Write a protein that binds this DNA or RNA. Structure first.
Length: 60
DNA sequence: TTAGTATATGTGCTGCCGAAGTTAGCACGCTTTCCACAAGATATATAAAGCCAAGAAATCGAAATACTTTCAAGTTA
């Protein structure tokens, strides 16, 4: 893995990690967040969505 | 034709600094576009309550006067 990933998904993951580190959440929280983000990205409706949509996806 | 001279001939010398390799015994431990597919942005009840900002009324806070008290100095005695 980490090779069949788009630049948009990579930016989303990096934003997730950045917000996690800003809120100072543990690495377990970081891992759970990235896992849930990947699980949500698996779907196509969220995959091909808006920029604000994917930002709110990071947030949620 | 022969002695003197210039060249390259490979050879052998010198340093040249660097090259590999060495050093003993346990326990712990980014950009352009380009691209195509599907997702904004759109009417429309629709009951429901909570929220977020103008107005209108209300009462709290208190300030400028109206009463009473109080002295203190002065009166009829």
């Amino acid at each position: 893995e980490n090779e069949q990933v788009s630049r948009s998904q990579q930016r989303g993951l990096r934003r997730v990690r950045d917000l996690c580190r800003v809120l100072q959440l543990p690495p377990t929280f970081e891992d759970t967040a990235v896992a849930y983000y990947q699980q949500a990205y698996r779907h196509s409706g969220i995959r091909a969505a808006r920029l604000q949509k994917k930002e709110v996806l990071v947030g949620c």
